[PDB]
Amino acid sequence: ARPKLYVMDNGRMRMDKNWMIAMHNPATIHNPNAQTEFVEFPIYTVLIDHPEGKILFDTSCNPNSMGPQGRWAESTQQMFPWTATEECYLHNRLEQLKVRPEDIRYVVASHLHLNHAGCLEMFTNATIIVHEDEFNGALQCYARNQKEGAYIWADIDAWIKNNLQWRTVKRHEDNILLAEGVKVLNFGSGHAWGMLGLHVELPETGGIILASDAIYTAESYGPPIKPPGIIYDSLGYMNTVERIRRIAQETKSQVWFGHDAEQFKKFRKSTEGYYE
Amino acid sequence: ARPKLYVMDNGRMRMDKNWMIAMHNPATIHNPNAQTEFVEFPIYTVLIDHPEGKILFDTSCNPNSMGPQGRWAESTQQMFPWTATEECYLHNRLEQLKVRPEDIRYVVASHLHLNHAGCLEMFTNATIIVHEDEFNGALQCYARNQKEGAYIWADIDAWIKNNLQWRTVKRHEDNILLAEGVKVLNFGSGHAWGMLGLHVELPETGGIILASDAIYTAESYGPPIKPPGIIYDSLGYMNTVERIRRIAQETKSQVWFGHDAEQFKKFRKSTEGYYE
Ligand SMILES: [Co+2]
Ligand SMILES: [Co+2]
Ligand SMILES: [Fe+3]
Ligand SMILES: [Fe+3]
């Protein structure tokens, strides 16, 4: 099999650095009112155009996320603003590749945060692969009518109204062979309730691990590991990072982080080409 | 049957509020360089003068902690400075109660952080009860010559040279009946590797739970729970806080937080009296 892997630029987001690197600049006797920064980071998706079928990793943010009539609560827009041009929208990025939503066989949701699950509702002909604990956690946010937070009620509303077809990865489920050289990695709890990664083995490029928010950046990866402020299971997070490190060394694979500005710049995006 | 419980003022410490309440004030589009604060909080120990023997909960900081020739590293001194008058020193606080180190039968170390295990070395005639995981973790810090962070090399050095007698609480060990109405609570991992609390049943005052850093403050306690930045096991931390809440409700016990300025102000300290 000779697949093509595309990195699609789905805009940028800004947030408190402390979210990304917990306690990045601690206050001191000499700096008692220490300042944080408001850092920019990429929101990207990955399309594996595979002969067995098209696989999508993450879905970025929903077009109608930001704004006065935005699905995102105002507090969320102010803490995690998403800047993107129309071309950065997933549906347009796919269109520029002559890929219709209906052509996606599999969507892998690393987690159900606002900036990874925004456009799940588009893929009504796909099987949405998600960690059961992540699914459960988001569904509770919905049921309890939680309007703030990283789980967008209106996005979840849409998933349900659009009758998405789900395939939950069970807590103790082995990695899933989705297609030749494409494995869903079950990272479990850490950054969120349930994280999924991808291991892709390309004939030419070789091995790629899509870590998503299991590893925000290279600063996160280290060594040493510098965990995020947005974390559900600190222990599981630490374990997941080391697990990823071990797999990378054993499979001689690259590790693609979730939101690393520097790494993203070096990527070949969908406007220039792909990875074989 | 008729004991007296003393609260001993062992000084004040300042640190970044983000340590106490994580992400207490996140940056926004309108406040991108959001400032943290450098808050003050109490360091205290608890003496249970019990007919079966004297029980000490926590040991505060070592007198030789701060300063150019201080045991604490400068970075630590600058991030977590301890201010204390001679009288605030535990040795002095005990002397004013006509209690010699040698008279302590049991020292319960909630955890082995610098602000709780400073003066363990004094109690050479006591049994030091500590969580095995906390003990293990600190001994690793020592063995690896970790000089910075919350585990003071020189402090641990002194514990070993002074030949302290340890009694480790095993990971899955039940609560320990230390004396009539005195009971060691095995909280396990959370704030640190292994946390111990006390439940004291006082004839007059009733039930008291000593939570130490299992719960920093009333703000931590909520509801809802607002976890700290100094955390090892987020899940365990959350579980512990809720376990304490339950025990408190079922035993109609007060919950004494580790570092709550407001609550401490209301405590009757060793200079004014005791709790029966
Ligand atoms: Co996320
Ligand atoms: Co502590
Ligand atoms: Fe993300
Ligand atoms: Fe403390």
Numbering used by the authors:
A (entry chain X), B (entry chain A): 8 to 283
Text taken from the publication that reported this structure:
MLLs degrade N-acyl-L-homoserine lactones (AHLs), molecules that are used in a microbial communication system called quorum sensing (QS) to coordinate a variety of behaviors, including virulence and biofilm formation. We provide the structural and biochemical analysis of the lactonase GcL (WP_017434252.1), isolated from the thermophilic bacteria Parageobacillus caldoxylosilyticus. GcL is a thermostable, highly proficient lactonase with broad substrate specificity (kcat/KM values range between 104 to 106 M–1 s–1) for substrates such as N-butyryl (C4) L-homoserine lactone (HSL) and N-decanoyl (C10)-HSL. The binuclear center, common to all MLLs, is coordinated by five histidine residues and two aspartic acid residues.
Asp122 is also conserved and is involved in coordinating the metal cation. To investigate the importance of these residues, we therefore substituted Tyr223 with phenylalanine and Asp122 with asparagine in GcL, eliminating their role in acid catalysis, and kinetically characterized the resulting GcL variants. The alterations in GcL activity may still suggest that this residue is important, but the interpretation of this effect is complicated by the clear role of this residue in metal coordination. Curiously, in this variant, the activation free energy for the terminal hydroxide mechanism increases substantially, leaving the concerted mechanism as the only energetically plausible pathway with calculated activation free energies within 3 kcal mol–1 of the experimental data. Visual examination of our EVB trajectories indicates that during our simulations, the substituted N122 side chain interacts with and stabilizes the terminal hydroxide ion at the Michaelis complex, contributing to higher calculated activation free energies through reactant state stabilization.
